[PDB]
């Protein structure tokens, strides 16, 4: 069975948590608990493949930022979260690409950027702005929402295949 | 700050997941989606002392068996858990007691017998009988509703005591 090490990583409050939650529990968690580090075992089947996806639900909080490395060398694909009403949670997005690029040596890590919250109506991320930012990595962006499920399964199943790319 | 790496281990369908999920998010998953494997990291106030939870949520399918000599080896503390409306997983008790010692070779390891579903009036396992079972072994006896919440927090941190109490 083909295993994929996937890690969810952003800024403190883009909804990493109810993006994983939603994807495995198919449950919208309207609290806001922070994270240390969770992580889940989901078998799924994505293009006809039975696969088994290890996610790694990790601490936006910068306190945490050390616990980074070893996740960093660990995982093989990377959901790059943002929240589309919070701009300083896109801002952050280039410095969780620049750690991923560091610790593997690589510009060809698999990624998605990933905008989320897009049932909310205060957006102050342009969806364009967002594409190109996607463009410049040479990655995918997918916009979601981790309350109405929208582009969620897109977001990790859009993962998965970037990682068998790249193998 | 003090770590517990506490284990909840049972036959499928005991309500270990949804015992771990009330007590971190407090609600209740009405849903049964088989669990492969997944960890929580939680801090927690426990008689004055901020502790560290790392909590494991195993499979109770016997098609995983093989995964328990792993966290049975790193667990400090085990959560056994059976339904108080299904005696076979009662039975099943003795089976994951007998491994945690043989792994561990000890009989002094930190366990909790949890008589879950307690909200169910379909009782098959008198209480007596499972508080006669959790004395021959030494450990406490505690029964749960991972539904309304009764005996949850004091499960786990009785287990947490154990852990603590040992040392
Ligand atoms: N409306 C809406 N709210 C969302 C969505 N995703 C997350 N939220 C909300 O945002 C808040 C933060 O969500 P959470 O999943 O905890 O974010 P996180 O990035 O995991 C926080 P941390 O980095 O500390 O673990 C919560 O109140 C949650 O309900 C979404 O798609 N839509
Ligand atoms: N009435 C009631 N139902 C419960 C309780 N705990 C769990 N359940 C129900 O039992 C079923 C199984 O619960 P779940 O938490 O998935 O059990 P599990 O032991 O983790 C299953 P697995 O070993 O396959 O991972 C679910 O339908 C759940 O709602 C409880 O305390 N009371
Ligand atoms: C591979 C590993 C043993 C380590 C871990 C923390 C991790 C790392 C990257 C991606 C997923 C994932 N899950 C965990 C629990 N499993
Ligand atoms: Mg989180
Ligand atoms: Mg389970």
Known sequence: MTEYKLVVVGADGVGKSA???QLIQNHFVDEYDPTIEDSYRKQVVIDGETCLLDI???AGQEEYSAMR????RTGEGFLCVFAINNTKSFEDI???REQIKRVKDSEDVPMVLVGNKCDLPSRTVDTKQAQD????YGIPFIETSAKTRQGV???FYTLVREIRKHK
Do not use: E, G, K
């Open 69 to 72: 490395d070893q996740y960093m």
């Open 19 to 21: 993006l994983t939650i």
């Open 133 to 136: 930012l996607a463009r410049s």
């Open 94 to 96: 280039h410095h969780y």
């Open 153 to 155: 399964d897109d977001a």
């Open 56 to 58: 790694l639900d990790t």
